[PDB]
Amino acid sequence: HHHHHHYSYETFLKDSLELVKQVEQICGVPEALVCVMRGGMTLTHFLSLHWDLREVYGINAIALKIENIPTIKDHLKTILVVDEIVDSGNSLEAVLKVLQDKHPDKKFYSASLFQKTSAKYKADAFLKDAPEWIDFFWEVDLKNLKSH
Amino acid sequence: HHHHYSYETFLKDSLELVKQVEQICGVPEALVCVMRGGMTLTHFLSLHWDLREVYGINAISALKIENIPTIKDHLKTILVVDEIVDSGNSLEAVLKVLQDKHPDKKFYSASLFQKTSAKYKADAFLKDAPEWIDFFWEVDLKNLKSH
Numbered sequence: 001h002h003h004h005h006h007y008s009y010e011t012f013l014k015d016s017l018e019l020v021k022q023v024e025q026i027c028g029v030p031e032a033l034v035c036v037m038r039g040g041m042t043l044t045h046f047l048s049l050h051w052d053l054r055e056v057y058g059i060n061a062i063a064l065k066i067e068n069i070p071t072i073k074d075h076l077k078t079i080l081v082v083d084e085i086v087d088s089g090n091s092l093e094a095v096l097k098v099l100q101d102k103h104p105d106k107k108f109y110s111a112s113l114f115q116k117t118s119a120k121y122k123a124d125a126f127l128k129d130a131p132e133w134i135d136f137f138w139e140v141d142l143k144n145l146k147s148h
Numbered sequence: 149h150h151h152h153y154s155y156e157t158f159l160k161d162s163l164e165l166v167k168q169v170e171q172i173c174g175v176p177e178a179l180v181c182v183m184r185g186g187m188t189l190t191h192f193l194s195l196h197w198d199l200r201e202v203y204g205i206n207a208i209s210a211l212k213i214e215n216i217p218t219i220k221d222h223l224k225t226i227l228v229v230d231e232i233v234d235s236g237n238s239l240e241a242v243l244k245v246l247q248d249k250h251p252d253k254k255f256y257s258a259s260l261f262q263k264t265s266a267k268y269k270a271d272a273f274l275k276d277a278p279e280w281i282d283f284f285w286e287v288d289l290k291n292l293k294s295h
């Protein structure tokens with residue numbers, strides 16, 4: 001069927017620097033992050049430490065219900081929503097919808113490492129077109145290590 | 149003196165943490181990530197255990213616990229994860245609010261590092277905390293940029 005793409009820790013570090021650069025071009029350094037769990041956790045960890053951001057919020061998604069919706073402090077105006085891949089785009093669109101409804105005065109930008117060209121909804125910042133089959137080091141490294 | 153905690157060491161430690169946690173409470177039913185320190189660790193653990201119920205909580209310094217999660221009713225065995233226990237003050241305050249808000253659930257804590265003189269200790273930890281540790285999620289990205 002489809003060929004097997006893999007995203008390593010070293011590629012993640014290189015791309016994260018480029019992601020930082022592109023986010024700063026579009027909205028400056030964010031004042032807070034919303035991590036889409038689980039996919040965005042490692043990325044948002046690295047980004048929040050790089051930008052010295054202590055305001056890091058989480059949000060979950062499942063025909064979609066968005067769960068654990070954060071309540072962002074009033075003085076935070078520029079928020080970056082972070083996920084690792086946008087496939088159909090349905091989850092990210094729903095996440096941004098509930099976040100902006102709840103906080104109409106704030107500006108939410110979205111960033112993803114990978115982005116399907118066919119997605120109905122695209123992140124404001126993304127680095128790479130998503131192939132049909134790609135796995136990530138946070139998914140596969142532990143078990144190959146356990147297998148050895 | 150200065151320890152760089154690498155991605156490779158973190159992988160090996162994460163498997164051992166899984167083993168130690170399962171010995172104590174079995175496989176957890178959900179995770180609470182202490183942000184930011186527990187983020188990457190909770191990401192790897194939740195994927196390893198195939199757990200989608202992952203919650204965040206914030207401990208910011210003086211000390212305030214913020215963004216207290218509402219854990220669903222059917223989840224009873226919860227693992228709270230952070231990367232290092234120093235004084236133990238922030239983990240102790242996280243557990244107290246979680247237990248206060250969910251008196252029906254059992255919360256266990258796990259850390260990679262724990263300093264021996266900590267006033268409050270995690271249920272499960274792997275290594276004594278040395279004088280200072282650079283974690284790869286803290287330094288690798290600025291080091292790559294600057295070299």
Ligand SMILES: O=c1[nH]cnc2c(CNCCCP(=O)(O)O)c[nH]c12
Nearest residue numbers: 232233234235236237238239280281
């Ligand atoms: O060597 C270290 N590297 C990175 N971070 C730390 C910290 C702060 N986080 C620990 C939890 C705060 P506490 O409430 O337990 O005191 C202490 N030492 C180190």
